[PDB]
Amino acid sequence: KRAVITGLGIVSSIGNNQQEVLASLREGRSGITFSQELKDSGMRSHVWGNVKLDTTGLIDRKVVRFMSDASIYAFLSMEQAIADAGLSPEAYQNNPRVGLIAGSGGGSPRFQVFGADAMRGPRGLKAVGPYVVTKAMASGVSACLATPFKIHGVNYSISSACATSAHCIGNAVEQIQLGKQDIVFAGGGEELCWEMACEFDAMGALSTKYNDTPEKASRTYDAHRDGFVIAGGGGMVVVEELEHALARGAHIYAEIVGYGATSDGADMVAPSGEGAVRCMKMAMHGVDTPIDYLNSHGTSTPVGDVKELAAIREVFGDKSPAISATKAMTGHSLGAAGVQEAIYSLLMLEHGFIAPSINIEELDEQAAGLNIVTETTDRELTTVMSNSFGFGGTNATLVMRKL
Amino acid sequence: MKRAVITGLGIVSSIGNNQQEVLASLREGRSGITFSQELKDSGMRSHVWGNVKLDTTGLIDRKVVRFMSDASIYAFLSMEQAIADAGLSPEAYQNNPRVGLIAGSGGGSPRFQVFGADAMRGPRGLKAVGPYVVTKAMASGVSACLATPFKIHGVNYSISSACATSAHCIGNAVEQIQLGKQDIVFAGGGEELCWEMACEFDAMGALSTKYNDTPEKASRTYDAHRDGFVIAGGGGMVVVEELEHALARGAHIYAEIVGYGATSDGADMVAPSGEGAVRCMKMAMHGVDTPIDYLNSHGTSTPVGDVKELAAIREVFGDKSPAISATKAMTGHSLGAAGVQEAIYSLLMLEHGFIAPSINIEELDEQAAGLNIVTETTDRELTTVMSNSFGFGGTNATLVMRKL
Numbered sequence: 092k093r094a095v096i097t098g099l100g101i102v103s104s105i106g107n108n109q110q111e112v113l114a115s116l117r118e119g120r121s122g123i124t125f126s127q128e129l130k131d132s133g134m135r136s137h138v139w140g141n142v143k144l145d146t147t148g149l150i151d152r153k154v155v156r157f158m159s160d161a162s163i164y165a166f167l168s169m170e171q172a173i174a175d176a177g178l179s180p181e182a183y184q185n186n187p188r189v190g191l192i193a194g195s196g197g198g199s200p201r202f203q204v205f206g207a208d209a210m211r212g213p214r215g216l217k218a219v220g221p222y223v224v225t226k227a228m229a230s231g232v233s234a235c236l237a238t239p240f241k242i243h244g245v246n247y248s249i250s251s252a253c254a255t256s257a258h259c260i261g262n263a264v265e266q267i268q269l270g271k272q273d274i275v276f277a278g279g280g281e282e283l284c285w286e287m288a289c290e291f292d293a294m295g296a297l298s299t300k301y302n303d304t305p306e307k308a309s310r311t312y313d314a315h316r317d318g319f320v321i322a323g324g325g326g327m328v329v330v331e332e333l334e335h336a337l338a339r340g341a342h343i344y345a346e347i348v349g350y351g352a353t354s355d356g357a358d359m360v361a362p363s364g365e366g367a368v369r370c371m372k373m374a375m376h377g378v379d380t381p382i383d384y385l386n387s388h389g390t391s392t393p394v395g396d397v398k399e400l401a402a403i404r405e406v407f408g409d410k411s412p413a414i415s416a417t418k419a420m421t422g423h424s425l426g427a428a429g430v431q432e433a434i435y436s437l438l439m440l441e442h443g444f445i446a447p448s449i450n451i452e453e454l455d456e457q458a459a460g461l462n463i464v465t466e467t468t469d470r471e472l473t474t475v476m477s478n479s480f481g482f483g484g485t486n487a488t489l490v491m492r493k494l
Numbered sequence: 495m496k497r498a499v500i501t502g503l504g505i506v507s508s509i510g511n512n513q514q515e516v517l518a519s520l521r522e523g524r525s526g527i528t529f530s531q532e533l534k535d536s537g538m539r540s541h542v543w544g545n546v547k548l549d550t551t552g553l554i555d556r557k558v559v560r561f562m563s564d565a566s567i568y569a570f571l572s573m574e575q576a577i578a579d580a581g582l583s584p585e586a587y588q589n590n591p592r593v594g595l596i597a598g599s600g601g602g603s604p605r606f607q608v609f610g611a612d613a614m615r616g617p618r619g620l621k622a623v624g625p626y627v628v629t630k631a632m633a634s635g636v637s638a639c640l641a642t643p644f645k646i647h648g649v650n651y652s653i654s655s656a657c658a659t660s661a662h663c664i665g666n667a668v669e670q671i672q673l674g675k676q677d678i679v680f681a682g683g684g685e686e687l688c689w690e691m692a693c694e695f696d697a698m699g700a701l702s703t704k705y706n707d708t709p710e711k712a713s714r715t716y717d718a719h720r721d722g723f724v725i726a727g728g729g730g731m732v733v734v735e736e737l738e739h740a741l742a743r744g745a746h747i748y749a750e751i752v753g754y755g756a757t758s759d760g761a762d763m764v765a766p767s768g769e770g771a772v773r774c775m776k777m778a779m780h781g782v783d784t785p786i787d788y789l790n791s792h793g794t795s796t797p798v799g800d801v802k803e804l805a806a807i808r809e810v811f812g813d814k815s816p817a818i819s820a821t822k823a824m825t826g827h828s829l830g831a832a833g834v835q836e837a838i839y840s841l842l843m844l845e846h847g848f849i850a851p852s853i854n855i856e857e858l859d860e861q862a863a864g865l866n867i868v869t870e871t872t873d874r875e876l877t878t879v880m881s882n883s884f885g886f887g888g889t890n891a892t893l894v895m896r897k898l
């Protein structure tokens with residue numbers, strides 16, 4: 092059984108819907124800004140990929156009271172996807188064959204800390220309030236959406252750091268392949284806050300040399316890259332069984348023709364390369380069309396960028412595809428990156444262009460030879476690949492093809 | 495589709511630090527619940543917990559344990575036990591694409607999240623945070639922290655679904671085997687025990703608060719005077735394995751996973767709907783040609799929650815219902831670890847031919863009328879058992895495990 096994408100929705104640093112995102116991508120436009128909050132917290136990195144949207148009022152009071160930002164972004168993305176897929180309430184609500192798999196990387200460090208802070212104050216439990224569990228818990232994104240959308244099928248979160256939402260999409264596909272669901276909403280969200288960001292800064296993973304020029308901070312494949320730029324936001328796609336989509340006349344973006352999920356079994360925070368090779372090969376099994384474009388994980392870290400470039404080489408040899416790292420524009424939204432980047436790749440597929448890998452002033456010599464596109468290029472694409480690798484050695488790749 | 499069997503297990507819980515200690519506690523109806531000075535001192539109203547009674551110092555290598563929170567530690571130790579209990583050696587499971595790991599927690603690590611924030615706000619900032627908080631604090635700590643040292647090359651991610659977490663992990667492991675993608679998947683989870691997390695459940699009124707002077711009686715599923723669940727910590731891990739692969743190596747097989755239910759209420763955030771659980775149980779029983787001999791209920795010792803599940807059980811089974819016991823009355827609610835720990839208690843009951851008692855029922859709730867709630871340890875020859883895990887957000891998991 093075959094799985095296709097029939098709707099998408101997105102809230103990111105570069106746009107609050109697929110149209111705004113489309114524009115940003117075609118224009119090579121950065122969503123990175125200076126963050127007083129990060130600076131005020133005592134961090135060395137003072138730049139981020141922020142959602143440019145005040146979300147107050149956009150969700151019913153009785154629904155949003157249970158939600159952290161990760162859930163808010165995913166909820167809003169899911170509203171867009173439902174509408175983009177043309178699904179009425181009666182199509183998807185109160186339906187055993189309709190499910191939801193969506194997560195975050197960090198849950199909500201902000202609300203974990205708030206609960207602990209409140210509890211140590213003069214008010215104790217009355218300051219904590221009864222809503223922190225659903226905000227702080229690691230399954231908040233799925234729990235907070237499944238309920239108001241009246242989801243009856245599967246309902247849980249995958250979590251795998253930077254691969255989170257990619258595994259969510261892959262697992263949705265598996266639910267379709269196993270015949271258990273006709274539709275699975277798949278994606279994720281991530282909050283943006285110093286509570287989480289300082290943890291990445293404390294291990295040296297974030298960019299710190301470019302705070303005066305926020306838009307030049309994220310620079311995948313550039314010789315002077317110094318870490319990733321943390322971001323937040325959300326995404327959701329509608330994964331749907333093929334016959335079901337055709338039957339209702341759904342607009343199909345692409346079929347998911349490949350899904351790789353592997354493990355390094357090596358180091359905690361440095362990639363092995365092996366395993367990413369295996370992940371991509373796994374995603375290519377039975378796919379006999381060439382990859383026309385690869386959206387790299389490409390976070391703009393020294394070690395990580397070239398490790399992935401080496402894996403791409405080993406997998407593709409002398410038939411390596413056009414590559415770009417959209418994180419040079421968007422920053423790294425962690426758990427939300429997989430679904431957002433699938434969406435970016437889906438937009439490139441739909442509208443026939445390759446988004447630029449920006450901010451390469453001096454190309455890293457380990458990237459010599461490869462087809463890294465630094466300029467918006469119109470091209471008919473048929474098959475695209477997107478890589479998601481996280482801490483803990485967890486790997487995911489999605490391969491999507493036009494029908 | 496391929497068949498999936500459990501060929502090994504491991505556990506660190508309030509009622510035992512391995513499967514032998516746990517077996518003893520279950521047959522005796524021993525409580526794992528103690529008074530907690532940490533909880534009382536935090537300013538909480540619940541002063542009891544299902545704590546792990548183990549000095550974990552020295553048990554994990556220095557360079558491995560440094561990335562780990564308590565949930566990871568408990569899961570890691572449970573996984574060592576499971577590997578050994580399965581008769582598996584490194585040459586068989588390490589660096590093997592067809593061997594994976596699916597394990598999670600409900601909350602990650604509130605403790606190290608708050609430690610990170612506290613440390614950062616101190617005078618030394620980043621230097622006081624140090625480079626290890628992300629792996630301690632991230633939601634996927636449990637999978638990350640085990641898959642690296644155990645050299646896992648197959649699938650590697652966590653599932654989170656609150657109180658149904660490690661039950662969905664097991665079912666997802668089964669699905670990997672059914673899809674022919676993996677030969678072995680280690681499945682389970684862990685959960686830390688700390689005021690940082692526990693205070694959140696107390697602030698919503700979910701935790702027992704009236705029985706602090708009698709800790710071993712606070713967790714009392716189905717009793718008319720229950721007042722909320724007792725929070726617990728610990729870990730569990732089972733080895734999920736493709737059937738032919740297991741037989742070909744002469745593995746010891748506890749049971750086959752013949753049913754997996756996974757559904758959603760789509761109702762309310764913190765109150766169960768009933769019809770979700772009904773559907774979950776029915777899905778898990780689908781095609782199972784034998785009756786359910788025993789049911790390990792979710793039964794957390796909460797007023798509305800306990801009786802809601804009973805009403806679902808009655809709808810599913812009708813007059814001819816199975817024997818029921820709520821082991822959380824002994825153990826407490828280990829949240830993310832609960833699903834795998836209770837799958838294990840159920841397997842131990844399957845393997846050793848008995849039903850553990852639903853303890854602390856001084857006065858049966860009127861709404862339990864006419865079900866078979868087992869309140870004393872009774873030896874029986876069980877064939878087919880069922881375990882229910884329901885979580886906040888209306889997330890439902892049910893496992894049905896049967897002897898070969």
Ligand SMILES: C/C=C/C(C)=C/[C@@]1(C)SC(=O)C(C)=C1O
Nearest residue numbers: 358359360361362395480483484
């Ligand atoms: C153990 C694996 C670590 C990995 C895949 C790390 C990557 C490449 S994933 C990622 O987002 C960053 C910043 C990295 O450095």
Ligand SMILES: C/C=C/C(C)=C/[C@@]1(C)SC(=O)C(C)=C1O
Nearest residue numbers: 657762763764765766799884888
């Ligand atoms: C929306 C569903 C909420 C559920 C299943 C809540 C339950 C019964 S599950 C659980 O662990 C506790 C303490 C509860 O109160």
